[PDB]
Amino acid sequence: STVDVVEKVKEIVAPWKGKQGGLIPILQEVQRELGYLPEEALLTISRELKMPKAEVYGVATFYAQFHLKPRG
Amino acid sequence: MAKAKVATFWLEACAGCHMSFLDLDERLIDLFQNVEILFSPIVDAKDIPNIDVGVLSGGLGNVEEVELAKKMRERCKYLVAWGDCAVFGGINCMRNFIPKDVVLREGYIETASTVNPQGIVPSEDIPELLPRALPIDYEVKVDVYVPGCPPDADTIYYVFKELLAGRVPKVPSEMMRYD
Amino acid sequence: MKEITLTIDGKVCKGVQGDTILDVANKNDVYIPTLCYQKGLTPIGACRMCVVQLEGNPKMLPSCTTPAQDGMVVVTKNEKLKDYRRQILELLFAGRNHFCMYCSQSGDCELQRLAIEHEMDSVRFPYLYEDFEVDATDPNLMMDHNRCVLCQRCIRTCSEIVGAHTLDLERRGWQAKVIADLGKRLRESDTCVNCGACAQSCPTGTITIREFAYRGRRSECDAVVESVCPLCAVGCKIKTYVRTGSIVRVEGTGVEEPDGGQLCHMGRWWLPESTER
Amino acid sequence: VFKLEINPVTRIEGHGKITVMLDESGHVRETRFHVTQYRGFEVFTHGRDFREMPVITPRICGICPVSHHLASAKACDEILGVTITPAAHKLRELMHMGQIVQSHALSFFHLSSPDILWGFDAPVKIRNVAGLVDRYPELAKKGIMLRKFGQEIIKTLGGKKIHPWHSIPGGVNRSLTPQERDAIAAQLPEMKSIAMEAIKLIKDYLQEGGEELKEFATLDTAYMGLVRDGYLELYDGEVRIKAPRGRILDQFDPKDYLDHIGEHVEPWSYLKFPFYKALGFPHGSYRVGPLARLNAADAVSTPEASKEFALYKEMGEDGIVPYTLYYHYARLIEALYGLERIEQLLADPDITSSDLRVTSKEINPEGIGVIEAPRGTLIHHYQVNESGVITKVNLIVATGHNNFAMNKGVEMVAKKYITGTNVPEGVFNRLEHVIRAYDPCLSCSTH
Ligand code: SF4
Ligand code: SF4
Ligand code: SF4
Ligand code: SF4
Ligand code: SF4
Ligand code: FCO
Ligand code: FES
Ligand code: 3NI
């Protein structure tokens, strides 16, 4: 559910608020627990870390390990 | 008897470059006294003769233009590309992002004011469109490039005077324009 | 010392120990080709057109990011550098789809001027005919990615000067692209203030103000007058361009002040829209 | 059993190919005129902003770029829902008159005059503008000067001679100044004299070989034109179709063209066949161009062109001249008209005006621009979305209307002058002159 991922990634970004770094590990752990990075996950990561959406989408699509669509 | 043998043609042009050749108004009259014009879009010769300066305009979109460019290349020693359509590919290359089938179909079936419930596309007695429109430097070997859309009259006249004087010219940077 | 001296093109130039070579060159008059350099933004180093070499050292150094050091001789024009710069321009033209015939910036584009100054009359490369998106969803700004040099001066202007970090780079490699928030079109992005600082920063004709297309070319103006924006209290300095009794373009002078030349939607949309009432 | 191909037809604009199919006994049974180029301006313009169209569409042809410029300007004007300042109207009409003058001068002097002066049986190497300036130098320089006048008007208004830029969506970019206005106005006498000289030449040519030149590719069809209240208009007006005998059939408003005109597609040509829908194909097909214009229009608005319009009207019945080779004559009349029209525009103190733009903030989903290009009627039709992005484009250009007339004329001269095989290069030249009378812009047709 698109509402489950909201709180579920809230609990993954919790240990990282206000620590000056560690965004690619956040994305790594959202990839581990979802297999892909949905748009809702990225929007909530941006709203919690108060990092712009352009930055999180740029770093999410920079690496080949991540995926923006559900994988087979 | 000491006249040159300029021979010109257009492949996939809009006639713009030949009309910019035709606006050398008095320069045209004083150039005809130094150039005899064999096969050309404004003369009635049907086949290309052995020439000295061959001039091509437009790109390559059909299977006829490729063969005509190859003929003009074999029949001349100095080839001159006129316009961005021959030098860069030009506005024709705007259709290189849509497949040929979709171009012909949406241009002859899907347009308004078109009535053909059969679904005919023009496919007989006429050359077939290439999959991609390309510049002339894909099938021939160009000697002088004249970029523009269309090139100015002064540039065409400069290239003519330089080639009929015996030197292969390069369009100077103060008169080069891509329009 | 804080007072160094170099020799660019044989001409002796003065400067300060902290600047780069391009700054010492621009400080006197000296010319160096640049495409990704913008006064007021931290040097990026992407186009590699500002390359320059010293006597003795065969290496090539980017004049915009390498610091100046007293005693070095700088050579800006020779056969090698002309060849390399022409190859870079031909790569840029063969990679993307540049149609100068109908470009809105077809007489004031930095790439086109650099191509004409280097006597580019062929691309020498197989002309990759790739399909790039043209984003005209926003009624005011248009982003035609067929004309992108990927200089990132739009991503640096919406980040350090504006703050509305709406632009960034999508997938790496040759598939690099300038996107809005989360890959959306500019009209779907909510973090945009419609300031047009990106249109002023773009050197090519990718980002373009739509309603003044083909009229707001700085090359075909009649007069340039600098004044102040009356609409609000900030009072931003402007660079009004006049053509046939009409304001065709308002650009923000002040790329040295903290504003950075970014004007508000009003300053660069209402003021040229006011002269046609 | 076999075939004759004149391809490529010369001294016309574009790529054409006439094919005659002879039977076993050596007689003509079928003849076609194929257009062999296509680029896809209706297709590759999707996704572009509409303000980009007045610059892309002139690249359809370099003989009439001002016509496509102005039609695209009108279409974008109706997309913006703006009704342009009287000054912009007059400047657009001045540029259109310059284009008419230059196109008719080119199509009479540089492309068809050898067959008018030397005949259809002249040698091949001398039948061109080079041989013309060699033997008739005064006439060649006269035509050159007339085309120079037209294209210098186009240049002073729009910056360049070919593919100019003057007309923005909403109005016009530049205005004339007294200096250049008087510089243009002081050149009109010799241009009128050149037009009258050409009119004399063509009238004596047609009266010399009087009646045989009246059966040359003559077929009774309908005539389409643009008209004001009753007057010949080239910029604005209503579309009027006249039956082959004078009766007006479906005079309508340009924007209602999808209800009256349809294009039939044939497999052997990239050119379509527009026709009046209520009569179908190939019965609803009509003619466009100078002849059809002067047949559909009832009067003209300039003195020295009316004095010749009367002489033209008293050549055929019902105020209708169906003869194909009279096109040339009609064409010159238009050129004359154009010159005189300029003399009325330059005398209006709103040509040097300053109110030239009507900018608005409104995007309507449809815009139709219909004008009178030198060879006939030109219709642009743009369909955009709310963002101003082009969704659909439809073009119907002048020579495309004249395709059926060209085919029928070519077939007539084919089974009138081709006796058998061993066809000399004087019968092929007539098979090309039936095309050259309409003076086709084959790049406009297959946009
Ligand atoms: S470059 Fe321009 S003027 Fe020349 S043929 Fe192509 S479209 Fe026509
Ligand atoms: S951005 Fe510059 S180089 Fe590219 S098409 Fe436009 S004018 Fe030409
Ligand atoms: S309009 Fe302003 S906020 Fe929007 S992308 Fe451009 S610079 Fe950034
Ligand atoms: S849009 Fe313009 S400023 Fe941004 S990267 Fe592309 S060329 Fe550079
Ligand atoms: S440009 Fe905008 S912010 Fe600057 S002074 Fe004018 S109204 Fe104020
Ligand atoms: N003449 C012409 Fe071109 C055509 N047909 C236009 O408009
Ligand atoms: S301009 Fe010096 S590296 Fe980009
Ligand atoms: Ni035409």
Numbering used by the authors:
A (entry chain C): 4 to 75
B (entry chain E): 1 to 179
C (entry chain A): 1 to 277
D (entry chain D): 4 to 450
Show sentences the authors wrote.
In summary, we have described the cryo-EM structure of NiFe-HydABCSL, an electron-bifurcating hydrogenase consisting of a conventional NiFe-hydrogenase module (SL subunits) and of a bifurcating module (ABC subunits) that is highly similar to a previously characterized bifurcating heterotrimeric FeFe-hydrogenase. The structures of the NiFe-enzyme show that none of the previous proposals for the site of bifurcation in [FeFe]-HydABC hydrogenases are likely to be correct and that instead electron bifurcation occurs at a single NAD(H)-binding flavin in combination with a unique arrangement of three iron-sulfur clusters.
The structure is similar to that of the apo state, but the HydC Fd-like CTD and the HydB NTD, which were well resolved in the flavin-free apo state, became invisible in the high-resolution EM map. It is likely that the FMN and NADH binding caused a series of structural changes leading to the release of HydB NTD and HydC CTD from the main body of the structure and becoming flexible. FMN and NADH had well-defined densities in HydB and are stacked in parallel to each other in a configuration that resembles those in Nqo1 of complex I. Compared to the apo state, all the FMN/NAD-coordinating loops underwent substantial conformational changes to accommodate the two cofactors. Because it sits at the meeting point of the NiFe-S1-A3-A2-A1-B1 and B5-B4-B3-B2-C1 pathways, the single-flavin FMN must play, at least in part, the role of electron bifurcation.
